[PDB]
RNA sequence: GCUUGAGUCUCGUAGAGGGGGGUAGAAUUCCAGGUGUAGCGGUGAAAUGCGUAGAGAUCUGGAGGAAUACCGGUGGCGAAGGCGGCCCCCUGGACGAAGACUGACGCUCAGGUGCGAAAGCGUGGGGAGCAAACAGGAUUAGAUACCCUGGUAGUCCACGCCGUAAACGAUGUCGACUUGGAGGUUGUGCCCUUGAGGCGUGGCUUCCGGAGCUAACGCGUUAAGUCGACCGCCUGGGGAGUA
């Protein structure tokens, strides 16, 4: 059970769906027994390059604690998905808890 | 790159281009792929940057 | 390289205690359970030849230390490759 | 004819040639002028001469829009380019935005061997 | 720096047109340049910075 | 027996070390479409080439392949070959701090085995750019070249082969000792930090130089100095690294 820090775009047009989203991917996290440390919903912001056009998108920051397999599982839902547009997962950096 | 026009101006005069752009960058990739002149231009162009 | 619960689970067996990490018997046991943990990951990959520049050096250090322990004492060296299951 | 009454001044500023293409902010051109068909074919057409004859010459032809606001957009190196843009000024234009848009790669294809002159 | 969220400082550290600032400018020490590097270009992928000034 | 060699464990650090998978942005080419019109491209100059069947320029949409600007640095990592977007997974090594443990377990190495740029070969893919061959245009006395316009293998992927390079610090490996200076990079301790602090202690690395050595040139604590261990190789040029 190591660290990691998912952000991940969201298309505007489904930015209503996007706490109900938030909820069962940390509901994901919660079936293998990781724990979530922060979560941030940074709202519908300026994109610095359009992408798909598409400018202004919804971003998630999530800082999950988690086994390796349910962040797998939940990268390959961010793949099928077409809500979500770039993901990133990344490093341990062990657990953080701030803003910015 | 992009300079607006100024309300009282005749020579917008952009140093723009000059910082970046035209004199190395383009003249640079004109000519081959090598991995080799590029180590020793490097490396006497950082040989001859001495006191 | 390997877990240090797993590192601590070998010195615990085949040290006289915890604390004799560097006796033959558990340097011996240490590379032997990274030499098999990496026959898992080159049986994939088999490729990667720097990892088993590093493989190599582990098999060849086992080595030079069963010579040792062989020609120091010979009933530590038949209990210990016993308890191991290497020689074949 | 049909108005525009702003647009972007695409000029395109090689070794060999510049050519300049008066368009609209759509990005229909409305009309161009090169220096190789302004005369001087040849070791004169890459000068900034000849960039501000094709540049002038580019002024005319479209006098039936009744441009007065226009971005510039500068590709290539060249002899020209510099010179181009007077040009445009000395042709009652309000020059606006003058951006250099010289594709650069981000490390992409290979460039040609060439040239052991 | 070591972060890549805080694009404030991050576009200090960057040029008009998207480009990262040589170290031979700015001071900023050889680890921090990588790591400030690398975090722009995490930053560029988000969308956070722009990759070049003309997209 | 013993710890000053060698190794193990604890905690961290930096890194283009390796292998697998994914993704991103610029750009080139192609395709479809809009505007638009007489050239474009190229060169020392030209011509071949492309273009009123509408090119080049320009905007929109798409496909595809390769490489990854800026950071980037006599910077880093690797035994060497070599390794440069970003992210994940598997994995090798190095270095540092204090302490513990084993207790000479070490060094070199003929045969042997492994790894080994590029080009090349085999099978199957892929093929945007570049480009041996090739074709055309020039140049020229000639031009099987340099220059121009095209352009196939190849370069890219998977697996196997080859087994070489100015594979080069033209400097085998390991260890010890012998004046200095300026840097770079990566650890760390101490001390008003009371800066752009001070003072030390390691690892790797760059430039200049002292003694010494050297035919000289130069090397110069990373030695080509002063020694020890083991290996490899040399014995005039050619013929010939050939039969």
């Not at chain 1, 989203?21 to 079936?31: K, Q």
């Given at each position: 059970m190591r660290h990691y820090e998912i952000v991940f775009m969201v298309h505007p047009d489904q930015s209503e769906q996007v706490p109900g989203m938030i909820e069962r991917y940390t509901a994901a996290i919660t079936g293998a027994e990781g724990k979530i440390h922060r979560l941030e919903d940074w709202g519908r912001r300026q994109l610095a390059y359009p992408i798909n056009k598409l400018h202004k998108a919804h971003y998630v920051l999530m800082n999950v604690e988690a086994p390796q397999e349910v962040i797998d599982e939940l990268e390959t839902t961010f793949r099928f998905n077409?809500?979500?547009?770039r993901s990133m997962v990344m490093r341990t950096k062990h657990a953080v808890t701030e803003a910015s | 790159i992009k300079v607006r026009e100024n309300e009282p101006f005749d020579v917008a005069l952009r140093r723009f281009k000059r910082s970046c752009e035209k004199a190395g960058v383009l003249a640079e990739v004109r000519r081959r792929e090598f991995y080799e002149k590029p180590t020793t231009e490097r490396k006497r162009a950082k040989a001859s940057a001495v006191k | 390289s390997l877990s240090t619960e797993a590192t601590a689970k070998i010195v615990s067996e085949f040290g006289r205690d915890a604390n004799d990490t560097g006796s033959t018997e558990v340097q011996v046991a240490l590379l032997t359970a990274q030499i098999n943990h990496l026959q898992g990951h080159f049986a994939e990959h088999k490729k990667d030849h720097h990892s088993r520049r590093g493989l190599l050096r582990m098999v060849s250090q086992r080595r030079k230390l069963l010579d040792y322990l062989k020609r120091k004492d010979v009933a530590r060296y038949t209990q210990l490759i016993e308890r191991l299951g290497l020689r074949r | 004819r049909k108005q525009v009454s702003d647009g972007v001044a695409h000029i395109h500023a090689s070794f060999n040639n510049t050519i300049v293409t008066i368009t609209d902010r759509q990005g229909n051109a409305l009309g161009w002028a090169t220096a190789g068909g302004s005369?001087?074919?040849?070791?004169?057409?890459?000068?900034p001469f000849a960039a501000q004859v094709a540049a002038e010459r580019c002024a005319d032809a479209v006098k039936e829009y009744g441009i007065k606001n226009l971005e510039v957009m500068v590709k290539g190196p060249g002899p020209g380019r510099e010179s181009t843009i007077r040009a445009l000024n000395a042709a009652?234009?309000?020059?606006t935005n003058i951006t250099d848009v010289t594709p650069i790669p981000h490390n992409g294809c290979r460039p040609p061997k060439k040239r052991r002159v | 720096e070591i972060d890549y969220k805080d694009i404030a400082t991050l576009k200090n550290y960057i040029?008009?047109?998207?480009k990262i600032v040589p170290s031979r400018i700015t001071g900023t020490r050889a680890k921090y340049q990588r790591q400030l590097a690398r975090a722009i270009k995490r930053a560029r992928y988000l969308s956070l910075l722009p990759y070049t000034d003309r997209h």
């Amino acid at each position: 059970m190591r660290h990691y820090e998912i952000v991940f775009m969201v298309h505007p047009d489904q930015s209503e769906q996007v706490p109900g989203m938030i909820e069962r991917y940390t509901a994901a996290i919660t079936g293998a027994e990781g724990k979530i440390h922060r979560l941030e919903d940074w709202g519908r912001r300026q994109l610095a390059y359009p992408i798909n056009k598409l400018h202004k998108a919804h971003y998630v920051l999530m800082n999950v604690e988690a086994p390796q397999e349910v962040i797998d599982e939940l990268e390959t839902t961010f793949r099928f998905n077409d809500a979500v547009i770039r993901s990133m997962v990344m490093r341990t950096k062990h657990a953080v808890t701030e803003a910015s | 790159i992009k300079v607006r026009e100024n309300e009282p101006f005749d020579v917008a005069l952009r140093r723009f281009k000059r910082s970046c752009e035209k004199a190395g960058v383009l003249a640079e990739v004109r000519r081959r792929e090598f991995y080799e002149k590029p180590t020793t231009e490097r490396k006497r162009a950082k040989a001859s940057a001495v006191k | 390289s390997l877990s240090t619960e797993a590192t601590a689970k070998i010195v615990s067996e085949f040290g006289r205690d915890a604390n004799d990490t560097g006796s033959t018997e558990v340097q011996v046991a240490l590379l032997t359970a990274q030499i098999n943990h990496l026959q898992g990951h080159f049986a994939e990959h088999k490729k990667d030849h720097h990892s088993r520049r590093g493989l190599l050096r582990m098999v060849s250090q086992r080595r030079k230390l069963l010579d040792y322990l062989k020609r120091k004492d010979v009933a530590r060296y038949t209990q210990l490759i016993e308890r191991l299951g290497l020689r074949r | 004819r049909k108005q525009v009454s702003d647009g972007v001044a695409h000029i395109h500023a090689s070794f060999n040639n510049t050519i300049v293409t008066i368009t609209d902010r759509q990005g229909n051109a409305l009309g161009w002028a090169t220096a190789g068909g302004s005369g001087f074919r040849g070791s004169r057409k890459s000068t900034p001469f000849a960039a501000q004859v094709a540049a002038e010459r580019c002024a005319d032809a479209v006098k039936e829009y009744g441009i007065k606001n226009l971005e510039v957009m500068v590709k290539g190196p060249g002899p020209g380019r510099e010179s181009t843009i007077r040009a445009l000024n000395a042709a009652g234009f309000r020059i606006t935005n003058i951006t250099d848009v010289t594709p650069i790669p981000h490390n992409g294809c290979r460039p040609p061997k060439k040239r052991r002159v | 720096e070591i972060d890549y969220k805080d694009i404030a400082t991050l576009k200090n550290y960057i040029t008009e047109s998207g480009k990262i600032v040589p170290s031979r400018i700015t001071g900023t020490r050889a680890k921090y340049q990588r790591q400030l590097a690398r975090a722009i270009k995490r930053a560029r992928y988000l969308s956070l910075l722009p990759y070049t000034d003309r997209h």
